């Protein structure tokens, strides 16, 4: 890619480990653990 656009923060993984999608998340489907996989929504207080 010629330049990098950041994804929205809710599409950014908290876990930087490269195989985690195959080695863990392919079998782990606990609800709370699933929610923790991505950063939560974050907004300037102006926009609420």
């Amino acid at each position: 890619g010629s330049s990098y656009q950041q994804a929205p923060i809710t599409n950014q993984r908290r876990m930087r480990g490269i195989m985690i999608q195959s080695t863990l998340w392919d079998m782990d489907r606990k609800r709370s653990a699933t929610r923790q996989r991505y950063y939560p929504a974050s907004t300037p207080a102006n926009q609420l």
């Binding site: 195959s22 080695t23 392919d26 079998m27 782990d28 606990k30």
Partner: protein, 273 residues
């Protein structure tokens, strides 16, 4: 030829089989009945390996490859040119390794030693027998054995690992690796400690059990003692081979999925499912 103290020890007795007939030496080597059977199996098994190299594609030492039979032959003897030769060499190897251990028991008995050395070597024989007898038997074909070739058996190890996608996740394999690595650390420490008291800096008195005891306690926070460090080395080294034998025998006969998905039980404990 004999060590300058040796002749005194070369008595009869201690043989398990054959009485006095084979109770003699050939140069440094003790013979005995299992000495005779060792040389029989070593010679036959070696010459069949040379024949396997002759009928194979090359004489290059690294590339020689005596493969087991196809799985379709099951527990039968294949045609010799199609893996049957590997089976005969395997019977020779078992005969040789067994004879070697029993010959060591005769030597230890003749010197008034305990049996520790034969039993320690039994741990290596167990791992071999697991790789070529027990696991192939539980899978129902001798063709599950590893080929006899210096690099071709490493191709077998590679492919068996990836049969389970990510063999590092094998739980018994993690234990076996931990024993192998801890053994190498313990060997370095024990070797260094003995040498450093017996070979101090120039112009320094020879050290003592007290100094190595003090230094070892500074390293691990406890004093293992002289008998304990040899017990620990034997425990680590033999335990490594036993856990190796476990880790391969569970792979296939018992677990057939990828090893990462074995850990699903840990994720599903009821405290945190």
């Amino acid at each position: 030829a004999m060590l300058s103290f040796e002749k005194k020890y070369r008595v009869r007795g201690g043989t398990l089989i054959g009485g006095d007939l084979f109770d003699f030496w050939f140069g440094p080597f003790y013979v005995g009945f299992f000495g005779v059977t060792t040389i029989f199996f070593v010679t036959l098994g070696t010459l069949l390996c040379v024949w396997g190299a002759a009928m194979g594609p090359t004489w290059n030492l690294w590339q020689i490859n005596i493969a087991p039979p196809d799985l379709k032959y099951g527990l039968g003897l294949a045609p010799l040119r199609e893996g049957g030769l590997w089976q005969i060499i395997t019977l020779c190897a078992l005969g040789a390794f067994g004879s070697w251990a029993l010959r060591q028991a005769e030597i230890a008995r003749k010197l008034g030693m305990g049996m520790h050395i034969p039993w320690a070597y039994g741990g290596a024989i167990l791992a071999y027998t697991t790789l070529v007898v027990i696991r192939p038997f539980l899978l129902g074909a001798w063709g599950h054995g590893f080929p006899y070739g210096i690099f071709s058996h490493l191709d077998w190890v590679s492919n068996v690992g990836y049969q389970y996608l990510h063999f590092h996740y094998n739980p018994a394999h993690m234990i076996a690796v931990t024993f192998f690595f801890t053994n190498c650390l313990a060997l370095a420490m024990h070797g260094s400690l003995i040498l450093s008291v017996t070979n101090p800096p120039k112009g320094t008195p020879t050290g003592t059990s007290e100094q190595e005891n003090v230094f070892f306690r500074d390293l691990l926070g406890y004093s293992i003692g002289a008998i304990g460090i040899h017990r620990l080395g034997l425990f680590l080294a033999v335990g490594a081979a036993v856990w190796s034998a476990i880790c391969i025998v569970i792979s296939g006969p018992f677990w057939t999925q990828g090893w990462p998905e074995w850990w699903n039980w840990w994720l599903n404990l009821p405290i945190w499912k």
